[PDB]
Copies of this chain bind each other. A is one copy, B any other.
Amino acid sequence: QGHVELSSTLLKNLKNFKKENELKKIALTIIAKHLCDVEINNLRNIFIALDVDNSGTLSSQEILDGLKKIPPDIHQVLRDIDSNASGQIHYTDFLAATIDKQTYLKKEVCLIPFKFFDIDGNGKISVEELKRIFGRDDINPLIDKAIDSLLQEVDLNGDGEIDFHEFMLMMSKK
């Protein structure tokens, strides 16, 4: 009542995606590819309304025209999309970046990327398995630094592996 805030869940997630850790971003992409239309219905409807040229992708102009036809945080998102390979955000990546914890933060949902990452099925993501998510396990000191930084942040018990409880906690954060 009076002057209030009805914040956009879709925009909050969209601006937060880039800054999420690299494991969470891939887990969110896997989740987005597995959720059915009933679970992402609001995001699908918005994407269709914005995708005026039916390209299956959104440009910065389509997103900008939507904030008009229908802040520094949203302006940075537009510049981040302009800077990527195609100058666009594909449907799947848009869903990954906009899906909310209310939808994804559930054991049944997070088990989808977790089981995929856990190659041997021992309930833990080893350093080798973790490296295999991002690139070839044969080829770099920058890769080792990124893995070490990812492990510090996620491997709470410091046993050099990622269990399901640690995976759920990381998925909830930020």
**Chain B residues positioned under 8 Å from A63 (CB to CB):** none
Determine whether the beta carbon of A56 is less than 8 Å from that of B105.
yes
Quick one: which of A67-106 are within 8 Å of B by CB?
70, 90-93, 100-102, 105-106
How many subunits of this chain does the assembly comprise?
2
A57 → chain B closest CB, angstroms: 7
A85 → chain B closest CB, angstroms: 12
22 interchain pairs (CB within 8 A)? Answer: A3-B138, A8-B30, A8-B34, A8-B112, A8-B116, A9-B33, A33-B100, A36-B174, A37-B174, A44-B172, A54-B164, A54-B168, A56-B101, A56-B106, A56-B171, A56-B172, A57-B106, A91-B105, A92-B100, A92-B101, A92-B102, A93-B102
